[PDB]
Amino acid sequence: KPGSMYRNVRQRSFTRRKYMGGVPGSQVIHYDMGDKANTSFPVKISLIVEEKCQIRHTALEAARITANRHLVADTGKMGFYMKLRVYPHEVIRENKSGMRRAFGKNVGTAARVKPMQKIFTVAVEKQNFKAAKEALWHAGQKLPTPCRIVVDEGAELVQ
Amino acid sequence: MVKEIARTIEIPEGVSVSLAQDVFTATGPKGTVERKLWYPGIMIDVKDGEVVVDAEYARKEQKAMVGTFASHIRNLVKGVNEGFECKMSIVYAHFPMQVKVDGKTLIIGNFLGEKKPRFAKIIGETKVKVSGNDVTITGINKEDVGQTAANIEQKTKIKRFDPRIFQDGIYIVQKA
């Protein structure tokens, strides 16, 4: 089931789970990676999507896995802090007959993100800026939107 | 500092470079050579034993073209003055190649045991000499000498076998 199905935003939100029934649980396990009790990381880069889209929980999990693997391999187990900012709140549904009673059944969850919205933020030391940049580039390849990396803190510390 | 696109070519004594029409002609002790060098936006001037190639504009294409034209002019004057020599080596494992010149072609017989000899073409007034187990290629044109050496090396290509075992052929050891 391709991500192009539940990708475009054409509809209102579908998030009130007390008026629906049976939502499959999200695949994304953690939302904070690296060293969670460190705040004195001078450089902080984030990945912002540049289109209004819906990101499925499986896409978020895939991007998170790839970025976390790259960061752990390059900077080490606690050489970085990584935050997945958005939670999949939207419930995705599918119509599984034809068009009669076509209101779908819940098949997953997605995060409805806006243009220029931060998806992932990574904090590292000065020497790991390019590694964090590379990891976030790999993470954005798993997402259904074009992305761009921005430096939030420590711009003068990289160039 | 100041970027200059124009390039200067010195004309050694005995070399009479002319640029009538859009064709460049160089005459020297080793012979005479003539090449076509035309490209819009590039200008070539011959003056006082010195050719200068300049472009009207300064974009990357004009920079590349002035560089290429200056290199061609320098090679032409060198060819009319000092010429070019290209060295190739004859290597074989089991079958001794029979290599000889029959005019404007090089006969490569018994290559890998074949009953039909190979034929490599000579370009221009290029001088190919089989110096025993090696081949020397000389001429006034760097284009012609390079192409003649390339023809010799490409004609001796083992086109199906593993290159790490079958290595018979004639290979350039020094370019023009």
Partner: protein, 138 residues
């Protein structure tokens, strides 16, 4: 008598078509093999072999091969040649490979705005090269 040497094919064709539709002269075009088509050689050859090999045999387009016939066809597409005015215009046009013996020594003219030295690059081919790569003997 227009000398087609070093002239853009479409611009020469447009000029000659308008002149023929101004309805006062017979136009002769010589050296049609020496007309120029701007653009890379691969693209022009690809498009001309696509046009040459297109139609149906009982029906389809019969795109010519001779450079003079190709040039006449190029002018033909800028005329209302199915109309009496266009038919009259096409009857007053003669295109030649080289110079015909009768027109030898006649005073020729050239269209200044169709000149190929107004092009900014060297990406061009002559019409004769296209014709001979399509298999035309001339």
């Amino acid at each position: 008598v227009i000398d087609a040497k070093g002239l853009i094919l479409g611009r020469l064709a447009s000029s000659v078509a308008k002149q023929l539709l101004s309805g006062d002269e017979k136009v002769y075009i010589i050296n049609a093999e020496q007309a120029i088509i701007s653009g890379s050689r691969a693209a022009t050859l690809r498009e001309y072999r696509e046009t040459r090999e297109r139609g149906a045999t009982e029906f389809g387009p019969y795109f010519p091969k001779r450079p003079d016939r190709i040039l006449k066809r190029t002018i033909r597409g800028m005329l209302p040649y199915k109309r009496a005015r266009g038919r009259d215009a096409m009857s007053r046009l003669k295109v030649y490979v080289g110079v015909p013996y009768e027109l030898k020594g006649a005073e020729t003219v050239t269209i200044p705005d169709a000149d190929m030295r107004l092009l900014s690059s060297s990406r061009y081919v002559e019409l004769g090269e296209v014709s001979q790569k399509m298999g035309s003997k001339f």
